[PDB]
Design a protein around this ligand. Structure first.
Ligand SMILES: Nc1ncnc2c1ncn2[C@@H]1O[C@H](COP(=O)(O)OP(=O)(O)OP(=O)(O)O)[C@@H](O)[C@H]1O
Ligand SMILES: Nc1ncnc2c1ncn2[C@@H]1O[C@H](COP(=O)(O)OP(=O)(O)O)[C@@H](O)[C@H]1O
Ligand SMILES: Nc1ncnc2c1ncn2[C@@H]1O[C@H](COP(=O)(O)OP(=O)(O)O)[C@@H](O)[C@H]1O
Ligand SMILES: [Mg+2]
Ligand SMILES: [Mg+2]
Lengths: 1545, 242, 48, 98
């Protein structure tokens, strides 16, 4: 009786309410004032988060119920409160910055803007100064709108500042690569320490932090991130103008470095070794040593080869390696740092050694010999300003602080690199190092900027960044005298490139001729002579993927380099020795081999990488160990050898399939025989992890644990990580479990999930509005900012659970690079610490460039690693288990081979990962009461997926396996359990009584015959539909199958709920769904964010008519599916405006054609394995006799039920017998392949039978009766088919077919020759004969007219048309009659539209004009203007629809080839036909006025729920469409196939 | 992979090959069915016929295996190998594969095959596979190699080969030049070569004249006059049509 | 609409469609026109 | 007509200098948004009698009619010339080619 607990919780929750209050703190201004303001925000908000999450935690307990009403209070109030709260700190922090700023830049008209806000803020602020408590803040009135309006004002004042911010970036250039958002903070709050420290690094390369004098007026020193403290020779003057002191910092930093160097060097030139390791920063040491090298050498060569100098250096090195162990003792030294600054310097030496060593073999003749000029040389000029020279190129040194960041090991490749680059810089050209992936070429430039000392910016060229947006960036670089490398310059819009080349050319010309000023964007910019431009691009590779070919023009502005092969074994040993690992040379060789060999003789997986990036990591992998191992125990031999392998097996073991996994391990033994093995050791985490699976009620399976555990250190290893496998592999769950287990010991996990493909490119990445030139975030860009603010001791993970395209993903290259940084195209950039991990989940990496693959870590799952028997167990626990006993026993033995057989078969309707298949099998099996039932339900589950004939094979064998062969002898498919009788199975036909024209009144809700198929489709649905048992699923069957028909029925069975439909196409997109959903569904707010809810429905359902159609990107993923993918998975999506919205209650459902025909694209496994599905096929001719037999009866019995030949219910069934006979023969002989539009389906049988209503079969007189009734049948038939068929010979062929069946089945030539006669609307009994705006349900009735009689009648129309329009000498002849007769029938029918294809001049247009005029149909054709536009057209359409939909007058909408000034039109028409609606045609507000009238009309008519659908319906009845097109036109055939609806409708 | 590692490779090849064969077969059966019988083109078979008449076999196939551009020329190769392979396997189940002469024309991953001996030799020789190095010799058979191979149907362009030397090609001479079979295998580093170091010149062994990619490169008797061979652009192509 | 005799009868006179604009077709009006390039262009729609 | 490895901008740079001086020569590389400005550049330099050069026309093929239209319009000054860069692109308009 545990309501006690929850009651108690609530009580203390309630007690909290009043207890809640604030931390109010005073503050003074630029316009000195004093205000109380909030502190420790986060502390306060956490309250909310925690309590709210508590609430929802409570919601799940049963005992919740009793106290439900109180929960709503708090849920509401809190949900609202977080919103209010959250806003306010933004407001506060913005004011903090802007008020100082609006104090100084005082344009009174801008001040109005801000002052109103200040006023507005302070105003309600004081309500809280006064009222200290928090709960009150919801009590304040209109605060919602207050807050929201404010922020909007702040948005707008910002815009004024835009002009201003750029003038401040001109005033100081490093700003160009910082966000405005941040910038104004610094501009506004120049004084503020925490602002300073938290915004300094991002401005300046070197400096994490700075020391502060106690006075906070000045600064004595600066810190590296690493902690390396550096003093300042001259103290820093803090000043009120930010740029004024900033500029001074730069220069004082430079002067500090400048003097600091010479001080150091002068001690070192003297024989006494400088050795001020403590005094000087490793940056300077290396440099100072490197000139010592230089001077020595030039004095050296003159004197002697001076091997003695070499030996000196070997002793120096030797000295240092011994000190390496003396740097292990200090460890985490008190007030100590830079022992790794030692490791830095080591490699310079060793490069130098191998440099000299080669020179000694040359026995070089002179000081200024060439192989020395080759070498990279340093000098302290007599001007006391350093200079560095290579060959005849020399450059002055900028003295930018780099601070301690590993420099890459020199290598032969780098010689070439550097030299070509230096040469390029001599040429005043940029340098283009290109190569394959994992080459190292990006990092090279970066380090050469370091050795040369410039400040280096990294960029990532993506998203086709605006030429203008490049321009400014250049403008920024030039002034700074910085070095700008672009990483992946390749991937950029070709039009951009070319224009940018012009930008480059002008700049180079300035550098070369040493022009002080450069002109670009119409701007003269004082350009630093010390600037550098480089681009690092993979070739536009076969493998590489989506990257744009470069103009030759542009190429010339660079000097290329080939970075394709990098020596590794060199690099390999070096690092080990930098660690101080002793057997370096021996082991380095081994690794490289292991790699190359693995790569050589192991299965060449897509996803494997033995590229450099993998290797680079293994080396840190050991440096970590060696760093730990010396501390725990003292050093020894066997270990060192032993240790590398662990460091290796980290990178390795994830990827490997078991087979390969084993093969690799064995390989290691060979090259490292003594070492044997050492498994993963750590259990602390596994324990927590083991715990969670039990708490999540997931079954514990070893591999899962392994992979997760494996995953963990993989995450520590590298920034980005991948999870690969088919859906249901478990991969998504995997990481989800991890965080939980982890979180128990592991302070934090922050989760953000992009399904990147679901939303558009920009939504993800963020962009620049081209007009305003204002930035607007992207999801991950935004999320980055959320994670950077996040405290140091927090984990932050960004998940991308979606398919992969090099175009979007490769934009993270700078992020997942050795360098961890994310680059905005505005220039803003966002580094990350080890806090941050990144995660990708994906089906496969087919489209992956190697760049990305090697860029990040990775884990692999197969069917092998996926455990099925293990997963079924959890299904059993899910069941009540009243029958669970029975089921374990049944399934255990029965399931497997039945499974097997289907896998053997591999003949099935859609690709689903096993799980996918399995699951379908299982989800059908719940609740199965008897064994007998279970058999049926089993087969149900699986046989959904089989192509029909192979279904039989299955079912059959199931009874071989099962006890008995099925009761149904033939069509054992048809077997249905009897729930009450327990009587196994058979299927039945159910004849309905009531049938009349009433039942057939509507275009839909058509009375549906219930043959066996029916009862099968329903039985195979219904479990998944109803309430608790709910599943999302699909129906597959060829068009005309009946899917639409069946579903409609199926839904009606359900009482709870409403049915939202979508008629899909290529152009169908997410927002179409937003809105079609929004129409019938709620917009509400709850705890855990907003959500969409069904309105006034217990449940809601989404039906999607054709999923295939939405267009696939080149990489082959429709974003629409990807959306749907996200939705099922994460019950929610990212609203534009970057909100994340859930969906509280919707089943999702789809229909589709089997993938056969052209352009019905097929859908990713990710989505398909997620859901349930099944297939149906046209009823057999035997069954189709029965449909129409019963659909026929009413039409015949309405009139002349008695007449001899008719009634005769066997003679009725006969008709069905023959038409169906015709039906088949014509589908056999004519197909899509003959002509696109040859579309024949039972829909056509229906269109043919129901078409018969229109004809006056009264036969008030006693009937022939054959020739009266049958010519009609013939004439209709002929109208449906023969009209459509193109060729003379094919028509001839058709006629034969027709005639044959008729003769055979009834008399002979009851066709006869009725060529003289036309049945038409003009001329019918009951005097139908214009007024008559609302059409008959089955259309205008039709009567029989002669040619000669008709010829008169047309001229009657021509006369009366001559009054309204131009008169015409239009002649009549049989064809014209025929033409017009056929159109009349169409236009009389509601929703009836035409497609008139023929050669110009035999006018569709002249005949069509008339008919409509004579109908009284309103006839619209758009007037085309030079301003043809989507605007014209939308208006037009809107107008037309308005007419037919509101006014109800019959309307012809007409279009000719010439009218289609924009391809999109047709997609609209295409949609319009199918659905009677068009997306983004109306906006929601527009509807209110339009449909208001219909609100009553509809209710009188009898309709329930959303009116728009009524509107639609109405449209469809009175709106007819016509299109004239030329067979000759090239895209004629195209468009027909493009817009399926076109020939279908 | 079986207990003995060389074989593992060939069974693999056996399988992966047959897998391709049957992918091709299905992409052939499909298009075989529309012409004579009842089918509706999908975008797949729509893409198949595009390949044939552009005269370039599909990226569909060439993604799986880099084959010759001419689609027929592709098939003839694909097939001829497929069957040969079955013969290789036969000689292999019986541990009899070393003993014959094997042309590497047949293999899809001949390099990998080569690197498969590298294991089997070290198995027999009990050595870290990093320790071995590879060579061939026309002047007889390799003594210090625990296991060897006789490779025929190698072919050469731009220089002429006679035992122990290479010569210049005369005008008349077909660009293509048949080359004598090798003896091949794996041998200790820092052990005596079959040829002294300086006499032989390394040459690539390309998959075709197109010569996009390489199987391996071999050292071959300079007979002095190193540059002329390079300027000759001498190279070796493993096989044509197989 | 201009190339076709797409004229509508307004009493005695005949008015003609141009974009939104309706103009009286002056019966003396005749048109001729040219291009420096053969193709482009015409559609078979326009050839007629 | 450019081919791979072909750059005339340098030869022209030199000829500009050689047969003229005064920085009369001005140039534009085609790309996003340039087309509207190019007209002005053309118009201006045509009127001036200075040399103007336009690059990579093959990229922006749709433009050309607008260009050639204006070219039949525009009024030269003696000593004014037009210089044009194009990769091989079909559908490149015959009128201007003429
Ligand atoms: N430890 C476990 N024991 C039993 N069942 C599990 C376990 N972990 C996951 N499952 C179930 O396995 C199925 C598949 O797991 P998961 O959803 O992770 O695949 P996935 O990575 O999401 O594939 P996709 O992302 O393509 O959908 C789910 O239905 C899940 O409930
Ligand atoms: N059991 C049935 N009873 C009545 N009509 C059927 C039946 N099965 C198929 N039809 C006919 O076939 C067509 C099925 O079309 P429908 O299912 O609405 O579209 P789709 O096949 O494209 O999903 C209908 O026009 C219907 O008259
Ligand atoms: N029976 C006819 N007698 C005389 N002229 C005709 C006849 N049918 C068509 N035309 C000519 O062709 C024109 C109608 O062509 P139209 O219907 O506009 O062709 P389309 O519909 O193929 O574009 C008429 O204005 C007339 O000049
Ligand atoms: Mg890079
Ligand atoms: Mg998932």
């Amino acid at each position: 009786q545990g309501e006690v607990t929850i009651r108690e919780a609530l009580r203390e929750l309630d007690l909290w309410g009043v207890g809640a209050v604030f931390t109010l703190i005073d503050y003074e201004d630029s316009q000195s004032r004093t205000m109380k303001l909030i502190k420790d925000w986060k502390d306060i908000v956490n309250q909310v988060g925690d309590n709210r999450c508590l609430l929802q935690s409570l919601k799940d307990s049963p005992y919740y119920k009793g106290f439900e009403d109180k929960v709503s209070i708090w849920e509401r109030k809190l949900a609202e409160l977080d919103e209010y709260l959250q806003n306010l700190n933004h407001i506060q922090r913005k004011w903090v910055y802007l008020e100082p700023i609006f104090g100084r830049g005082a344009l009174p008209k801008e001040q109005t803007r801000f002052n109103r806000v200040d006023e507005d803020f302070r105003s309600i602020m004081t309500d809280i100064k006064k009222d200290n408590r928090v709960t009150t803040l919801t009590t304040h009135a209109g605060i919602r709108n207050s807050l929201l309006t404010i922020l909007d004002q702040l948005q707008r004042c910002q815009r004024s500042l835009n002009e201003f911010l750029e003038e401040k970036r001109s005033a100081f250039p490093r700003f160009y690569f910082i966000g405005d958002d941040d910038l104004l903070e610094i501009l506004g709050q120049s004084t503020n320490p925490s602002v300073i420290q938290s915004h300094l690094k991002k401005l300046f390369a070197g400096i994490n932090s700075v020391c502060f004098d106690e006075k906070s007026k000045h600064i004595t020193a600066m810190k590296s991130l690493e902690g390396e403290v550096v003093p300042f020779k001259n103290k820093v003057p803090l000043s009120n103008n930010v740029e004024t002191w900033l500029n001074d910092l730069a220069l004082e930093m430079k002067k500090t470095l400048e003097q600091l160097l010479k001080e150091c060097v002068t001690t070192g030139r003297s024989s006494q070794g400088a050795v001020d390791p403590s005094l000087f920063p490793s940056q300077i040491l290396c440099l100072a040593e490197q000139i010592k090298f230089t001077e020595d050498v030039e004095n050296a060569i003159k004197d002697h080869s001076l091997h003695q100098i070499e030996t000196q250096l070997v002793n120096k090195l030797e000295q240092y390696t011994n000190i390496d162990t003396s740097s292990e003792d200090p460890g985490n030294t008190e007030s100590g740092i830079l022992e790794l600054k030692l490791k830095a310097l080591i490699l310079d030496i060793i490069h130098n050694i191998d440099v000299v060593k080669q020179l000694n073999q040359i026995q070089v003749h002179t000081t200024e010999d060439w192989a020395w000029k080759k070498q990279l040389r340093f000098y302290m000029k007599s001007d006391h300003t350093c200079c560095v020279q290579m060959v005849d190129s020399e450059f002055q040194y900028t003295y930018e602080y780099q601070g301690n960041a590993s420099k890459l090991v020199y290598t032969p490749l780098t010689d070439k690199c550097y030299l070509t680059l230096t040469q390029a810089m001599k040429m005043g050209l940029g340098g283009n190092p290109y190569g394959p992936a994992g080459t190292g070429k990006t990092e090279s430039v970066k380090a050469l900027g370091g050795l040369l000392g410039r400040q280096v910016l990294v960029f990532n060229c993506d998203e086709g960044i605006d030429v203008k947006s490049m321009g400014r960036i250049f403008v920024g670089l030039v002034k700074c005298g910085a070095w700008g490398c672009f990483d992946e310059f390749n991937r950029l819009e070709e039009s951009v490139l070319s224009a940018v080349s012009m930008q480059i050319q002008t700049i180079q010309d300035a550098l070369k001729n040493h022009r002080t000023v450069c002109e670009l964007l119409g701007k003269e910019v004082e350009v630093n002579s010390n600037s550098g431009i480089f681009i690092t691009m993979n070739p536009a590779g076969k493998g590489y993927g989506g990257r744009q070919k470069l103009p030759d023009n542009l190429k010339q502005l660079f000097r290329p380099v080939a970075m394709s092969h990098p020596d590794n074994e060199l690099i390999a040993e070096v690092i080990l020795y930098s660690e101080g690992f002793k057997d370096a040379k021996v082991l380095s060789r081994k690794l490289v081999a292991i790699f190359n060999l693995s790569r050589e003789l192991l299965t060449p997986q897509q996803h494997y990488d033995w590229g450099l990036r993998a290797l680079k990591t293994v080396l840190r992998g050991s440096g970590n160990l060696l760093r730990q191992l010396n501390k725990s125990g003292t050093t020894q031999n066997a270990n060192e050898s032993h240790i590398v392998v662990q460091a290796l097996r980290l990178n390795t073991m994830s990827k490997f399939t078991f087979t390969d996994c084993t093969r690799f391990d064995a390989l290691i033994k060979d090259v490292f025989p003594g070492i044997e093995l050492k498994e993963v050791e750590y259990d602390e985490l596994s324990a927590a992890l083991k715990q969670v699976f039990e708490e999540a009620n997931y079954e514990i399976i070893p591999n899962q644990i392994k992979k997760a555990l494996e995953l963990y250190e993989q995450l520590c290893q590298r920034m980005g990580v991948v999870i690969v496998g088919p859906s249901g592999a478990g991969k998504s769950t995997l990481w989800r479990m991890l965080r939980a287990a982890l979180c128990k010991t592991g302070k934090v996990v922050k989760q953000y999930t992009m399904n990147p493909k679901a939303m558009p490119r920009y939504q993800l990445l963020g962009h620049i509005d081209m007009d305003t030139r204002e930035w607007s975030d992207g999801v991950l860009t935004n999320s980055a900012r959320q994670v950077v603010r996040e405290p140091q001791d927090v984990s932050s993970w960004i998940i991308c659970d979606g398919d992969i395209d090099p175009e979007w993903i490769e934009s993270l290259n700078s992020v997942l690079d050795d360098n961890r940084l994310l680059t905005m195209p505005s220039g803003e950039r966002i580094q990350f610490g080890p806090n941050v991990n990144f995660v990708f989940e994906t089906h496969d990496l087919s489209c992956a460039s190697p760049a990305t693959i090697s860029r990040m870590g990775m884990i692999f799952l197969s069917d092998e690693e996926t455990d099925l028997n293990s997963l079924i167990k959890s299904w059993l626990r899910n069941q009540p288990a009243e029958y669970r006993n029975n089921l374990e026993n049944w399934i255990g033995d029965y399931f497997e081979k039945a499974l097997q057989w289907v896998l053997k078969q591999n003949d099935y309707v859609v690709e689903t990962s096993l799980v996918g298949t399995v699951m379908n099998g299982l989800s059908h099996l719940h609740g199965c009461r008897d064994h007998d039932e279970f058999i049926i339900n089993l087969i149900r589950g699986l046989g959904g997926n089989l192509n029909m004939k192979s279904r039989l094979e299955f079912t059959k064998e199931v009874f071989h396996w099962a006890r008995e062969s099925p009761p149904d002898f033939h069509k054992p498919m048809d077997t249905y359990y009897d729930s009450t009788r327990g009587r196994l199975a058979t299927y039945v036909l159910k004849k309905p009584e009531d049938l009349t024209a009433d039942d057939f009144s509507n275009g839909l809700t058509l009375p549906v015959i219930q043959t066996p198929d029916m009862q099968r489709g329903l039985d195979y649905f219904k479990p998944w539909l109803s309430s608790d048992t709910k599943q999302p699923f699909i129906l597959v069957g060829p068009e005309g199958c009946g899917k639409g028909m069946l579903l409609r029925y199926a839904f009606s069975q359900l009482r709870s709920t409403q049915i939202a439909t979508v008629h899909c196409s290529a152009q169908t997109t997410s927002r179409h769904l937003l809105q079609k959903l929004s129409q019938t569904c709620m917009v509400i707010s709850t705890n855990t964010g907003r959500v969409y809810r069904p309105k006034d429905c217990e449940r809601l359902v989404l039906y999607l008519k054709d999923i295939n159609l939405p267009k696939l990107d080149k990489w082959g993923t429709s974003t629409l599916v990807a959306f749907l993918q996200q939705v099922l998975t994460y019950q929610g999506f990212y609203d534009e405006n970057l909100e994340w919205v859930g969906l509280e209650n919707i089943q999702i459902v789809a229909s589709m054609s089997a993938g056969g025909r052209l352009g019905r694209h097929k859908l990713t496994t990710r989505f398909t394995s997620i859901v349930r599905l099944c297939s149906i096929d046209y009823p057999e001719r035997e069954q189709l006799q029965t449909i129409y037999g019963a659909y026929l009866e009413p039409v015949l019995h309405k009139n002349l039920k008695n007449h001899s030949i008719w009634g005769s219910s066997s003679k009725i069934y006969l008709l069905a017998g023959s038409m169906v006979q015709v039906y088949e023969q014509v589908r056999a002989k004519f197909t899509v392949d003959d002509y696109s539009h040859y579309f024949f389906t039972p829909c056509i049988l229906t269109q043919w039978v129901l078409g018969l209503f229109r004809y006056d079969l009264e036969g008030g007189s006693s009937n022939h009766p054959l020739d009266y009734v049958l010519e009609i049948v013939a004439y209709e038939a002929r109208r449906l088919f023969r009209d459509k068929i193109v060729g003379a010979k094919e028509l001839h062929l058709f006629d034969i077919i027709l005639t044959s069946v008729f003769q055979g089945d009834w008399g002979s030539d009851i066709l006869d020759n009725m060529s003289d006669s036309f049945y038409v609307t003009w001329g019918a009994r009951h005097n139908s004969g214009a007024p008559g705006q609302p059409l008959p349900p089955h259309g205008k009735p039709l009567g029989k007219l002669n040619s000669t009689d008709l010829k008169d009648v047309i001229k009657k129309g021509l006369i009366h048309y001559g009054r309204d329009n131009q008169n015409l000498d239009i002649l009549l002849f049989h064809e014209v009659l025929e033409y017009m007769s056929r159109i009349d029938r169409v236009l009389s029918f509601p929703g009836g539209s035409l497609l008139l294809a023929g050669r110009s001049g035999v006018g569709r247009r002249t005949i069509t004009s008339l008919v409509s005029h004579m109908h009284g149909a309103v006839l619209f054709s758009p007037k085309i203007s030079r301003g043809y536009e989507l605007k014209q057209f939308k208006n037009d359409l809107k107008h037309v629809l308005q007419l037919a939909g509101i006014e109800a007058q019959q309307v012809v909408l007409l279009l000719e080839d010439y009218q289609f000034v924009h391809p999109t039109f047709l997609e609209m028409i295409n949609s319009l036909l199918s659905s009677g609606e068009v997306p983004g045609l109306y906006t929601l507000e527009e509807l209110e006025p339009l449909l208001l009238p219909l609100k009553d009309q509809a209710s009188q008519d009898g309709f329930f729920g959303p009116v728009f659908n009524y509107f639609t319906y109405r449209i469809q009845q009175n709106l007819h469409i016509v299109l004239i097109m030329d067979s000759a036109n090239s895209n004629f055939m195209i468009n027909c196939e493009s817009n399926p609806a076109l020939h279908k409708k | 992979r079986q207990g003995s590692p060389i074989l593992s490779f060939i069974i693999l090849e056996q399988f992966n090959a047959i897998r391709l064969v049957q992918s091709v077969h299905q992409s052939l059966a499909a298009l075989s069915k529309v012409i004579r019988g009842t089918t509706l083109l999908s975008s797949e078979v729509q893409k198949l016929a595009s390949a044939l008449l552009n005269q370039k076999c599909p990226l569909a196939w060439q993604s799986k295996w880099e084959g010759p551009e001419d689609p027929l020329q592709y098939l003839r190769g694909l097939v001829a190998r497929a069957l040969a392979i079955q013969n290789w396997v036969d000689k292999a189940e019986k541990q009899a594969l070393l003993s014959e002469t094997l042309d590497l024309s047949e293999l899809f991953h001949p390099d990998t095959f080569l690197n498969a001996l590298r294991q089997e030799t070290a198995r027999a020789v009990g050595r870290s596979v990093d320790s071995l190095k590879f060579v061939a010799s026309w002047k007889g058979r390799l003594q210090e190699a625990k296991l060897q191979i006789k490779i025929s149907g190698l072919l050469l362009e731009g220089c002429s080969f006679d035992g122990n030397q290479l010569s210049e090609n005369q005008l008349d001479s077909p660009s293509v030049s048949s080359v004598l079979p090798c003896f091949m295998g794996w041998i200790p580093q820092d052990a005596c070569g079959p040829y002294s170091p300086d006499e032989c010149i390394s040459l690539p062994v390309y998959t075709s004249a197109e010569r996009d990619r390489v199987v391996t490169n071999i050292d071959v008797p300079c007979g002095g006059n190193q540059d002329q061979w390079i300027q000759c652009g001498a190279a070796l192509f493993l096989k044509n049509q197989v | 609409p201009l190339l076709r005799r797409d004229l509508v009868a307004q009493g005695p006179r005949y008015v003609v469609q141009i974009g939104d604009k309706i103009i009286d077709y002056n019966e003396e009006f005749r048109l001729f026109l040219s291009t420096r390039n053969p193709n482009p262009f015409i559609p078979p729609d326009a050839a007629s | 007509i450019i081919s791979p490895g072909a750059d005339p901008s340098q030869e022209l740079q030199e000829l500009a200098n050689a047969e003229r001086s005064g920085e009369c020569y001005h140039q534009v590389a085609m790309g996003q948004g340039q087309a509207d400005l190019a007209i002005q550049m053309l118009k201006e330099c045509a009127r001036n009698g200075d040399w103007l050069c336009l690059k990579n026309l093959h990229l922006v093929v749709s433009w050309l009619p607008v260009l050639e239209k204006e070219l039949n319009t525009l009024q030269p000054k003696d000593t004014f010339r037009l210089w044009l860069t194009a990769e091989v692109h079909p559908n490149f308009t015959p009128i201007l080619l003429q």
